[PDB]
Amino acid sequence: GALDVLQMKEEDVLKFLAAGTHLGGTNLDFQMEQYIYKRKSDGIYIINLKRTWEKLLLAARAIVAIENPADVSVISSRNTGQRAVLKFAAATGATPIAGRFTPGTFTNQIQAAFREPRLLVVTDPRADHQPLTEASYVNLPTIALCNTDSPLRYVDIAIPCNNKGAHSVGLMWWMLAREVLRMRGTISREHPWEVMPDLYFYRDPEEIEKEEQAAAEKAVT
Amino acid sequence: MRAKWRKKRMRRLKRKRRKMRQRS
Amino acid sequence: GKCRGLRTARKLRSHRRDQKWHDKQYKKAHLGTALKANPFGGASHAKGIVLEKVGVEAKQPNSAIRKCVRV
Amino acid sequence: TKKRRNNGRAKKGRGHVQPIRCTNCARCVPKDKAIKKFVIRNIVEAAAVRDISEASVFDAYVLPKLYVKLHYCVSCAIHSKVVRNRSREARKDRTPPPRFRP
Amino acid sequence: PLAKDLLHPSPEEEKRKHKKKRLVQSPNSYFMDVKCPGCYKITTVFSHAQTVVLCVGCSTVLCQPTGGKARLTEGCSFRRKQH
Amino acid sequence: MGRVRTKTVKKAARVIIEKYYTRLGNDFHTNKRVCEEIAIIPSKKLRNKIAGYVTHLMKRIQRGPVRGISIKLQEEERERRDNYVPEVSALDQEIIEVDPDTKEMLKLLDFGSLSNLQVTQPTVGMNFKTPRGPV
Amino acid sequence: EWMPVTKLGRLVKDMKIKSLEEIYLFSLPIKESEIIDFFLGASLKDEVLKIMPVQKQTRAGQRTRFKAFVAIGDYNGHVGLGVKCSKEVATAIRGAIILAKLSIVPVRRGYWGNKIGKPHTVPCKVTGRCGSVLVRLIPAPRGTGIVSAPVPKKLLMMAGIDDCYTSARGCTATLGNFAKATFDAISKTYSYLTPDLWKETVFTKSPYQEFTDHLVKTHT
Amino acid sequence: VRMNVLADALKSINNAEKRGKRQVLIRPCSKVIVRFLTVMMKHGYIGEFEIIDDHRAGKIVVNLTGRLNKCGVISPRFDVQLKDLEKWQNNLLPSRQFGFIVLTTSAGIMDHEEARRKHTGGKILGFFF
Amino acid sequence: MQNDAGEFVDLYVPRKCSASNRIIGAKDHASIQMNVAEVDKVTGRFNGQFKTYAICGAIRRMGESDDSILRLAKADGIVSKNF
RNA sequence: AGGUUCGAAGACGAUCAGAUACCGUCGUAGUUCCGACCAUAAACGAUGCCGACCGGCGAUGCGGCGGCGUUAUUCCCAUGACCCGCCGGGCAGCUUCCGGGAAACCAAAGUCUUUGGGUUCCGGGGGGAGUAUGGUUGCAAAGCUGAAACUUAAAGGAAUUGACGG
Ligand SMILES: [Mg+2]
Ligand SMILES: [Mg+2]
Ligand SMILES: [Mg+2]
Ligand SMILES: [Mg+2]
Ligand SMILES: [Zn+2]
């Protein structure tokens, strides 16, 4: 995103800070060092928000380059991210893989879950190590999310990020879906997207049973 | 046979041979 | 590692002829002990007189009486 | 076939290590090679802690502890089941076994 | 990183590098103006002084040589020399 | 004890749930009757063993998803889970806890000096590592 | 009677991919043996290299399986080597032929000197390795033939190498490692960078994105 | 100790090239090293290079273009005549189509094709292809 | 290829990695070819034409396919210089 | 010289079919010190030395250079005890499809058919045999150097499966 229309907005800066994308971990990977801005006195590495915006746009231009929207496949094995990838594919027309990624999905053609994608998207290189490894057998370019300590072994468009925070992950998928839609012919670049970013947030089952009844109590009162 | 005890047996045989040569 | 210097030909040649004594074929063909010990004395064939007819048992897996002569 | 990278002993920069005696058989074992189990035992067993405390003239006494450091050769350690054989991959794990305290 | 710009490294890592392992060698030491108390003149002391430098006019010692760098006595103001 | 279902009865029970979901219900006897014609089972014992596990499964799936799959069960449960629809987003905080180093990064970006943001006191002590060694 | 399961097989079947080199260009793995016999039709000559009876010691004395080595390829610049271990010799033969078909690579041919006609030898001296076996192919002048052991000789003849010197090292008696080393050396003839290949590459569309409009309607 | 600066330069270039790096730094710079780099760069096997001048023996930064298979050296600088330059070509070069042997002649440091063209032999330095 | 008669005697010309210039072999299944859809200036929508990059298996396996792609896009203007 | 303990040899008591042993009780030489010999160990990292290059990470020992802070005393700094880093030299460790290797494994055992940085020692199927003989060293025990005849189709290394284990 080298253009004025593809420039970060103040509201997007606020969303990034609120979610916690700028925050990282206490461990630095030598291949993620370029995206790191500075390490605070707490030890948490701080991530250049300008650089994650550029990598987010780079991944967006990569995704929209594929004519078949379902050719790209979004994979998230961690509970902080099934909802994000499911809603991502629901908006962008992609193909989601929520939960465990069974081995042999890309290499073994016998099982019914076998598929032939043209692009792979990962929430965590550490958690989703298996789909990344199988991407190396099938000529599969990968956009993957990141961490300050993530291994970039088969990662190409690693967007600097905080993949541990539930709010950060949901926002990361939200802006990725927003940007691919926006540079496609679905959003006219002017008005804010009608989709609220919290739609992709994964809420724990510890409160999924009590928030709806407390909401009903608030509505009647 | 254990190599160490084969070595020890060999030393006995060498000492016997030196005894016989000195005798002549 | 082996020396590759431009003026090491003496050491290379001396080491070769020193180490050549460590293989059986060169040692037996140049020491002369094998030639002396050979009953034929380096000859392909040799004539003799049959002292007696003898029979020799075969090795362990086989079982036969090989027919030989002491000559 | 080198079984262990460290040859079963914690000697890296040394030439020689003074030996010790196994507390079970008096085997001369290098100190860096022997199995050291430092036990903190109760002076009185858990069945008789009550009887000693009841008979104690003091209103609040704390029973002492035996601090004995034990040195084992690997043969007495294995025979006494202090250490066990492990898999090829399991042998490379140097963390102490869990205490199972709760 | 395959495409590190060896020819033009930024100053911070050059300062971080060892003096001989810099792209061009540069001594870490420096000369500095040292003003001993109770005098007027300015004497030059090596930052890695190995001998006890003596303020000539004023009696008190200036720097006690230690392992790496000179140990300036209290009250001794020092200024750098052309970086 | 000893009531574990074989993979034969289990897989057969799953399969008929996959294909015939509307035809089946919560009642055991009705499920065993529909099992007569949606599938052929040479054994009566297998017939009501399969039907028994079908009612057990359908009771479980009436309130959640299992390793069985229905194409309808995917789509209406994704139509559901709309959102908690909070009146406002959770990321529109009026004030954001921002480190002074972070604000320095933001002004380098040039998006600093926002009235929404407020700087926080930097932590002092620099002791973030855990004590090395056991305890 | 061939229903392709892969996207690539579908494109080959419906005449969308016009050459096997089109797949080789984008390095797409071949997962169906019926993909390539459509291209190299009736030109692949099959030879069995060895049937070795591997044994596994059980309580029942031993159990026996047969490992079949198969070299295949038209004598024009394609060669493949396949290994299959199976209980039956016939099943191992069919499995090894399928695997050899799948692992078919193109063979680069050059000239020993003074390039006049068609290329005949290896473009440069190459080295393949497997186990301890080190096999080195060496360019040879026109007419010298293929001087080698019989196992790499038939492998190179199928590759289409008319002239080649070879040098082998290690336990060449191990036929599997000897054939794999030769096949490895043959495969890396294109992987070797050469001044005539120094020219910058122009990129074309992969068959997936070139026929993605066709894949949605046929191979749904 | 370091007894062949050209050998260390060529081995460093080879290791960085195999590693895939865009640049390589050679710590000891020499006239022989610079001439060797010049004949490699003229043939196109490397890019531009810089000579960092310290008052000691300088350094060199070479721009690798990713088209160098091997740049070995022949440390004992054997006397290669023209009648046996063909044997060295067969022993060292990967083919008769490309590849070069660098040998210092009385007309300067040059490749074997140029040495044959002006009919001069010399001491073999190394090879690259 | 291209003997002195002029005809291209080769059955195909392999691609080369746009980051390390190595030949991408026909059995290199870790190598990729990816496209970045460049946008237009006035509205930032995809304009049909895109930009192609290729990464070989070795570069994409040692972990530096990410940095290589970033550098290629930076050189081609997809990524602005202020990165 | 001194001999506390331990303890070759030895004795006795056990055990066993036997037990010249393993177990127990004594116990000589020795174990200790000084001097004079000997020059050998699985003297091991079973892994030459010097030099160059080629991944990452967290520690640790020494020295040095920086920096939030807590602590020691006093009135400030040093200066010590910690804390966060950097550099160099070390003992190492974890991880890695750098690469190697027969593999076990090794950031060296890598940079090797794409074979050459410098230079020592040293191996050539298994036995006979580290024997015979000669020379030399030693008070001796023995050390260093060191064959041949003859004999043999395998001996070995690493991994795999099984079988077995007091
Ligand atoms: Mg020792
Ligand atoms: Mg006693
Ligand atoms: Mg040397
Ligand atoms: Mg021998
Ligand atoms: Zn013991």
Would you write up a description of this structure?
By secondary structure, chain B is an all-alpha fold. In chain B, 88% of the residues lie in helices and 0% in strands. Chain B is built from 1 helix and no strands. Chain F has helices spanning 7-19, 28-38, 44-61, 71-79, 100-109; strands spanning 96-98, 117-119. In chain F, helix 5 links the parallel strand 1 and strand 2. Chain F has 135 residues and is mainly alpha-helical. Chain F has a two-stranded parallel sheet with strand order 1-2. In chain F, 45% of the residues lie in helices and 4% in strands. In chain F, helix 2 (28-38) crosses helix 3 (44-61). By secondary structure, chain H is α+β, with helices and mostly antiparallel strands. Chain H folds into 2 domains: 1-68, Ribosomal Protein S8, Chain: A, domain 1, CATH 3.30.1370.30; 69-129, Dna Ligase, domain 1 (2-Layer Sandwich), CATH 3.30.1490. Chain H has a 4-stranded antiparallel beta sheet, sandwiched between helices. Chain H is globular and about 40 Å long. Chain I has one domain: Hypothetical Cytosolic Protein, Chain: A (2-Layer Sandwich), CATH 3.30.1230.20. Chain I has 2 helices and 2 strands, in the order E-E-H-H. Chain I starts with 31 loop residues before the first strand and ends in an 8-residue tail after the last helix. Chain A binds chain G through residues 66-68, 71, 109, 114, 116, 118, 137-139, and chain G through 5-7, 26-29, 31, 208-209, 212-213, 215-216. One magnesium ion (MG) binds next to loops of chain D. Chain H binds one RNA strand of 166 nucleotides through helix 1. It is classed as ribosome. Keywords: In situ, Ribosome. The entry is titled "In situ human Hibernating class4 80S ribosome". Chain A: 40S ribosomal protein SA.
Offer a concise description of the structure:
Chain C: This is Small ribosomal subunit protein uS12. The structure is cut from a larger assembly and holds nine protein chains of nine kinds. Chain F is mainly alpha-helical.
